[PDB]
Design a protein around this ligand. Structure first.
Ligand SMILES: O=C([C@@H]1CCCN1C(=O)CCCN1C(=O)NC(c2ccccc2)(c2ccccc2)C1=O)N1CCCC1
Length: 708
């Protein structure tokens, strides 16, 4: 009932990659500003939108979604100075709001409402930092979902807006020096062309500046720069005593960093230029994440010779590795997620035990286990408690639990944590659904964890629509989260939810990470393909009714699996994904992902990439009874994280190579949203629209009837 647009093929766009010749006939789609690209985007949306709204389930869904998603969304309370703050979204607000109250008992008042900044909610808060005395506040503002940030400042008492403004900020830190004179932050060199998120220009030479309040940005002090290394990025932070400036130098997305420090008492007259950095750890062999310090003895969470991480103390007066003391040895199985120091000498260790979180209280001096905090199965997605705090707050979330915030007064003999707040989403009955965690072997036998959710009592006859989700990369762990959107799939679409913790992530330490990157990248596609076969063999679903979803790095995942095993799925939703594995390093911050995929500039890497690159491996099955799965690619014009050209070229390729076939009846579509980016800061209204599209696609393609 619909035909695809004619898209010019530049058959002369041939490039040589180490003796190999590859044709990129839609390379012209790499210019966001051309009239041709604009005409192409407008045309594609001209066929997608209608098709999506033509589904009577789309409105049913959006309605249901609007009611179920309408619940109070709170964040952990956190104390800065003598006041308390917490984010709160009454329900369907575009962006959450920052509240402030002088007392846990006192009345809270609005502090910062990003909602009065843009009628549609596409201006989001991206990063904030309070001054040591909690008397001054700084926050980053992002428009249309770009990573680019604008740092503004506020006076806490009275919530007065200051005139200071910092531009050209991206992937920056925010560290105030304890004297309250200024803050450290990162910026990029003023470059030609635009800088609003629609550009594809590569970000290099990020520098470290220091901004003194009450001055103009032209006056900022350059405190660190690496002109010999364009890719390095140095984030800064102050130690608990405000005496040292710790600079973590990073290159790429690997769990490793260089560690230089600066003794602020050694600076002749303060911060007037490039600091007298001491190159403590001058290499990229391991990650060193700062926890706390006592005098010159610093406590760090590291992964050095410890794939599952551990805590170690370093004395800046005797730095020799041969002298580091192990505070909390590495666990043989559990991965030490993060650590916090609270109440002067308490350590909060959060572990990942079989894709589940656990909280324990340890002693700083010896590092001995003091207490375990009971936690049901799920994850901790919120926490507050600084070294100066005498109490802690943490938020628990699961597949059927919207979230419980717990409190614990650490100044009491009996450390009994009590429930501070508990959210519930009526219209959904947890008692009706069951969560189960299984382990299935992959092509090489490696047992892989997977979560499974569905209504109780379902008969495993492969007659149920299944939704399999996954990421698989960059040391990212997919733990239990609440998702109204997905629960409506189970309840009103009789579907089965399942999440595979395939290799490439960090569910099992760096070892797990390295098991799915560079040369072992194919391991990620095998693990995920095996999870689909498992669900099909065990009776949960059938290929014709199995949908797979992934976003960003996970978009590469599903896009690649569709290419390698199209017979295994009946629907594919790839969100803002990577498709051109040959040039991803050429745009914006793509050069950073090479530590996981490699670079096509190397003849050794090229060989791995050319084997799975979604864009270069589209091919119509030779088998007559086999066609490509229905496919929906979601992208946006301001995604400066993963440029849209990846999806643009990939779709053009699909419709030409496959869409043009006679046996192809399954639609290959794309939707390019406007005024939105990679996903962070996306307004509540745009997000309701997105899921309504995704599930309208499934229901219409798999022909699923709604269940009241
Ligand atoms: O968005 C992404 C991936 C995954 C998440 C982070 N990411 C990024 O591409 C992160 C880009 C920006 N960035 C770096 O290039 N290094 C990080 C870093 C982030 C996480 C882990 C290690 C380093 C950094 C540098 C200095 C100081 C602090 C942090 C950072 O934020 N992808 C989209 C396409 C596939 C990968």
């Amino acid at each position: 009932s619909f035909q695809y647009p004619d898209v010019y093929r530049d058959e002369t766009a041939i490039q040589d990659y180490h003796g190999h010749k590859v044709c990129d006939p839609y390379a012209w789609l790499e210019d966001p500003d051309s009239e041709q690209t604009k005409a192409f985007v407008e045309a594609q949306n001209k066929i997608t939108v209608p098709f999506l709204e033509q589904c009577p389930i789309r409105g049913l869904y959006k309605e249901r979604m609007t009611e179920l998603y309408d619940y109070p969304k709170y964040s952990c309370h956190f104390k800065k100075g003598k006041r308390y703050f917490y984010f709160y979204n009454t329900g369907l607000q575009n962006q959450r709001v920052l509240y402030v109250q002088d007392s846990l008992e006192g009345e809270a008042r609005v502090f910062l409402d990003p909602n009065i900044l843009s009628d549609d909610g596409t201006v989001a808060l991206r990063g904030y930092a309070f001054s040591e005395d909690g008397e001054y506040f700084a926050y980053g503002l992002s428009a249309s979902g770009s990573d680019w940030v604008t740092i503004k400042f506020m006076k806490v008492d009275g919530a007065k807006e200051l005139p200071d403004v910092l531009e050209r900020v991206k992937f920056s830190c925010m560290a105030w020096t304890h004297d309250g004179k200024g803050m450290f932050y990162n910026a990029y060199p003023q470059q030609d062309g635009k800088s609003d998120g629609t550009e594809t220009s590569t970000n290099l030479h990020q520098k470290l500046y220091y901004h003194v309040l009450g001055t103009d940005q032209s006056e900022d002090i350059l405190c660190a720069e690496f002109p010999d290394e364009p890719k390095w990025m140095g984030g800064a932070e102050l130690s608990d005593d405000g005496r040292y400036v710790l600079l973590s130098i990073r290159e790429g997305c690997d769990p490793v960093n260089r560690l230089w420090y600066c003794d602020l008492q050694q600076e002749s007259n303060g911060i007037t230029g490039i600091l007298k950095w001491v190159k403590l750890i001058d290499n990229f062999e391991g990650e060193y994440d700062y926890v706390t310090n006592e005098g010159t003895v610093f406590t760090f969470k590291t992964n050095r010779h410890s794939p599952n991480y551990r805590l170690i103390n370093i004395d800046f007066t005797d730095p020799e590795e041969s002298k580091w003391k192990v505070l909390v040895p590495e666990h043989e199985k559990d991965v030490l997620e993060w650590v916090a120091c609270v109440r002067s000498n308490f350590l909060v260790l959060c572990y990942l035990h079989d894709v589940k979180n656990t909280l324990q209280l340890h002693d700083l001096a010896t590092g001995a286990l003091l207490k375990i905090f009971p936690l049901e199965v799920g994850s901790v997605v919120g926490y507050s408690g600084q070294k100066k705090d005498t109490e802690i707050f943490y938020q628990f979330t699961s597949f059927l639990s919207p979230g419980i915030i717990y409190h614990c007064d650490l100044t009491k003999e009996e450390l009994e944590p009590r429930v501070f707040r508990e959210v519930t989403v009526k219209g959904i009955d947890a008692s009706d659904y069951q969560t189960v965690q299984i382990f299935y072997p992959s092509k090489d036998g490696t047992k892989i964890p997977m979560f499974i959710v569905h209504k109780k009592g379902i008969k495993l006859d492969g007659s149920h629509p299944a939704f399999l989700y996954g990421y698989g990369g960059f040391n990212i762990s997919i733990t239990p989260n609440y998702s109204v959107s997905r629960l409506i799939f189970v309840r009103h679409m009789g579907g089965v939810l399942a999440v595979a913790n395939i290799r490439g992530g960090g569910e099992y330490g760096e070892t797990w990470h390295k098991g799915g990157i560079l040369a072992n990248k194919q391991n990620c596609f095998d693990d995920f393909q095996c999870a689909a076969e498992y669900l099909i063999k065990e009776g949960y679903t059938s290929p014709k009714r199995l949908t797979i979803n992934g976003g960003s790095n996970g978009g590469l995942l599903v896009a690649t699996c569709a290419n390698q095993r199209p017979d295994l799925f009946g629907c594919v939703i790839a969100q803002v994904g990577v498709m051109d594995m040959l040039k991803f390093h050429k745009y914006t911050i793509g050069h950073a992902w090479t530590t996981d995929y490699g670079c096509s500039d190397s003849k050794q890497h090229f060989e791995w990439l050319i084997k799975y690159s979604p864009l270069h491996n589209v091919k119509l099955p030779e088998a007559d009874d086999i066609q490509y799965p229905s496919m929906l690619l979601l992208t946006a014009d301001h995604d400066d994280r993963v440029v849209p050209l990846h999806s643009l070229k990939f779709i053009a390729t699909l419709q030409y190579i496959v869409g043009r076939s006679r046996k192809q009846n399954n639609p290959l579509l794309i939707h390019v949203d406007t005024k939105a980016g990679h996903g962070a800061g996306k307004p509540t209204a745009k997000v309701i629209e997105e899921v309504s599209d995704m599930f309208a696609f499934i229901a219409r393609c798999l022909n699923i009837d709604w269940i009241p």
